[PDB]
Amino acid sequence: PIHILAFPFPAKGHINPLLHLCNRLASKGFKITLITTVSTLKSVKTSKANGIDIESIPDGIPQEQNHQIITVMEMNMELYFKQFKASAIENTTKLIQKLKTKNPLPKVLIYDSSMPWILEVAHEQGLLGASFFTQPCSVSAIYYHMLQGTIKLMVSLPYLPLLEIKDLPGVQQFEDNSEAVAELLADQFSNIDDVDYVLFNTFDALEIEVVNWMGSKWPILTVGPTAPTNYLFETNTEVCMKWLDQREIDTVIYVSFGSLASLTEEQMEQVSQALIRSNCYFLWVVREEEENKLPKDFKETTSKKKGLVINWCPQLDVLAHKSVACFMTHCGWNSTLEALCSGVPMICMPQWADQTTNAKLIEHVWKIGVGVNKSGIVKREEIEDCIRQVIESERGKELKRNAIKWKELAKEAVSEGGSSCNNIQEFSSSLL
Ligand SMILES: O=c1ccn([C@@H]2O[C@H](COP(=O)(O)OP(=O)(O)O[C@H]3O[C@H](CO)[C@@H](O)[C@H](O)[C@H]3O)[C@@H](O)[C@H]2O)c(=O)[nH]1
């Protein structure tokens, strides 16, 4: 078989979409080796069934308690991203040298678009290099314009809706890391003309004009959603799906702020009271390190009547469940795309980076969500109003119909003859 190496950035919103692409490629007969940091591997709980080799490299940055890579990295982003980069260059080189003692020999390296310098490692090692963008073409275009200097982070950019300042990717939220973060985002396009394959986790129908514009510059391959319609980490699948199977159609608010965003105790309380004083069933993912900021008896007592509070869930299976009526989300791109492809309208509570832009696209372009309005805390009353809008109002019925329409276009994209299916086949055939 042809041997593909895959190197996501060490965060779940980067690992997961690449993992799903890898599972698709493995189904077509390719051998896959997934490259993870030690810290990522510590959280991997199931891997046997996917048949993918997992090889680990050092973190390359300090190990601070049991915190995640980006958490440590945020203490000093400019220094620690550079340390992560230098260590990853050296250790991916060493790992490829070792893999070259085994058959089948590696032939291609799919790497996260946020680590463009991995292209030089792939080419030095005689491999093809494929840059895998985990953000939509619309937001990625902003980073391209940042690299060209057309914009520095009302705003008008080619083939995007008119944006308010709050709609731009949120780099200011990173405080003394804002400048480093803006440079790393722009740098995704620094070597794009030398990449062997440019892959985006999106589908053409979702952003026709920006994809077309992008394609006028470089051959790009839209391959999304890579997610099927599955997990490396603990997802508490049995507890979650049995609770959802007890819920009636269209009754559950799914609530998640993803793998990284952490709300203050003050914000947690407003979300908590909003969910309670709404009278809806809710499944709220509160990561284990964030639990201690919940109200005193929320998890054990107050949420017991209508809520399931869980430290992680099988999000693809949850969003596919008929009981789910809407998705209160931080609007990370994976959650955004997974909800659209599942036909689930959202309540948008973006926190930083591309989430702000994603929320604007959700509400104003794809029209499958509403956005909370901050006061900078989002108040329980605002959340409750958004819940009624989606759950009870005529508008929410329109958002749901729009979400089902996108689900159908996404199904077509990944089915035989669809744009993403065609592009994955073109990629596979090229490797052959
Ligand atoms: O209980 C859960 C919650 C989430 N997920 C999955 O976790 C991932 C979350 O990804 P995402 O929605 O993209 O949010 P983040 O966790 O914040 O990660 C991303 O946040 C931004 C998304 O665009 C990007 O900068 C990067 O891809 C990455 O940092 C998705 O695959 C989810 O399906 C679960 O499986 N179970």
Amino acid at the residue 401: R
For residue 278, the SS3 value is coil
213 shares its domain with 324? no
- Two tokens at 374? 């901050």
* Bridge pairing between strands 369-371 and 307-310: unpaired
Identify which of 339, 183, 232 has the alpha carbon closest to the alpha carbon of residue 14: 232
Resolution (angstroms) stands at: 1.9
Tokens 């990370």 — which residue? 332
| 156 and 304 part of one domain | no
Q: Are 425 and 240 in contact (CB under 8 A)?
A: no
Same domain, 276 and 161: no
Distance 359 CA to ligand 1 centre (A): 14
Q: Same domain for 419 and 353?
A: no
Kindly state whether residues 273 and 149 are assigned to the same domain: no
CA neighbours closer than 13 Å in the CB half-sphere of residue 340: 30
Q: Which of ligand 1's atoms lies nearest the C-alpha of 70?
A: 29
The two three-digit tokens of residue 84, written as one number: 């992560």
113 CA distance to ligand 1 centroid (A)? 16
Is 341 within 8 Å of 227 (Cβ atoms)? yes
Reduced 3-state DSSP string for 230-269: CCCCCCCHHHHHHHHHCCCCCCEEEEECCCCCCCCHHHHH
Q: Are 232 and 44 in contact (CB under 8 A)?
A: yes
Say if residues 310 and 236 touch (Cβ distance below 8 Å). Answer: yes
* Residue 225 near residue 414, CB atoms below 8 Å: yes
* Maximal C-alpha separation, the chain: 62
Q: Which amino acid is at 342?
A: S
Same domain? For 303 and 200 the reply is no
Using the atom order of ligand 1, give the atom closest to the CA of residue 134.
27
Pocket test for ligand 1, best of 9, 12, 18, 184 (most atoms within 8 A of CB): 12
Report the distance separating Cα 72 and Cα 242, nearest Å: 36
Q: Say which residues have a Cβ less than 8 Å from residue 105's Cβ, sequence separation at least 6.
A: 3, 99
Instruction: Write out residues with Cβ below 6 Å of ligand 1.
Output: 11-14, 16, 134-135, 235, 256, 258-261, 285, 312-313, 315-316, 332-335, 338, 353-354
Provide the total of helices (H) and of strands (E) in the chain, helices listed first: 16, 13
Q: Which residues pair with 346 in a beta bridge?
A: 327, 369
Same domain, 406 and 417: no
361 and 213 within one domain: no
Give how many domains the chain has, as a whole number.
Answer: 2
The residues, any chain, with a CB within 8 Å of residue 217's CB and separated by 6 or more, are none
- Residue 334 one-letter amino acid: N
Q: What is the CATH number of the domain that holds 263?
A: 3.40.50.2000
What values do phi and psi take at 134, rounded to 5? -100, 15
Cα separation, 358 vs 333, whole angstroms:
7
Question: 93 alpha carbon to ligand 1 midpoint, in Å?
Answer: 28
The C-alpha torsion from 264 through 114 and 335 to 393, rounded to 10°, is: 80
265 and 166 inside one domain: no
Q: Residues with Cβ < 8 Å from 102, sequence gap 6 or more?
A: none
Instruction: Please enumerate in sequence order all residues whose Cβ is within 8 A of that of 428, keeping only pairs 6 or more positions apart, or say none.
Output: 25, 28, 30
Contact residues for 75 (Cβ-Cβ < 8 A; gap 6+): 64
Using alpha carbons, select from 97, 62, 65, 73 the residue that is nearest to residue 9. Answer: 73
Ligand 1 atom with the shortest distance to the CA of 312? 1
- In angstroms, what is the span from residue 432 Cα to ligand 1's centroid? 32
CA 367 to chain centre: 20
Whether residue 115 sits in one domain with residue 197: yes
Are 329 and 225 in a shared domain? no
How much distance in Å is there from the Cα of 49 to the middle of ligand 1? 22
Return the structure tokens found at 12.
Answer: 């779940």
Domain range for 120 is: 3-230+412-431
Are 242 and 102 found together in one domain?
no
